[PDB]
Amino acid sequence: HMRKIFLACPYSHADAEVVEQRFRACNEVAATIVRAGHVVFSQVSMSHPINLCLAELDRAAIGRLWAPVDAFYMDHLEELIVLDLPGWRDSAGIRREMEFFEAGGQRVSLWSEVEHEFR
Template identity: 65%
Template sequence: MRKIFLACPYGHADKSIVEKRFEASNAVAAQIARSGSVVFSQVSMSHPINKHLADLDKVGIGSLWAPIDQVFLEAMDELIVVDEPGWKESAGIAREIEFFSTRDRRVSLWSDVKTEFA
């Protein structure tokens, strides 16, 4: 069984783009789960919770999620990046790619592997 950490660009000044990214992450996570693989979608988990953390700025939210994400990064065998616009500019995705790459774990773009989950 594949154990997948799903990365997706998230932050943006335009809230409608944030919502679009959240929905894209959910759609991909659903497809992966339906295939029988284990998936942890960080954006799917954090977005609804972040709505209850309005008192925290971007740094505060990042500090809150960093140790939680670390647990899931270590538990998963591979990384799939939802290659929506903005993924190349995402510092979080860059860190996640580095984490998996330096441990010789598979890193893929969703557009390259989505047929594996059809």
């Protein structure tokens, strides 16, 4: 029972420190999922370090560049876990991902609700 998890997390924020904190929080949860032996695509873990190299583009432009890339991962993974940090209900990536997985009949969970399944 090796799970294939798309791990979503709120990202964009006016305050760069908040973005960094969300990044570090997502990295820790992704680490927990990996330690438990599952496949994860931690969207923020891979994109944040890359986004730092796209400083010339603005928040909105970045979101669009990632859209078809995130879709590749959505398409090949089996369930969605949303790391429900403050601001998660206002995240663009998150609403989209929840809708995609939900409509497809796939499992969607909040980390606060399933953290116990990984320890």
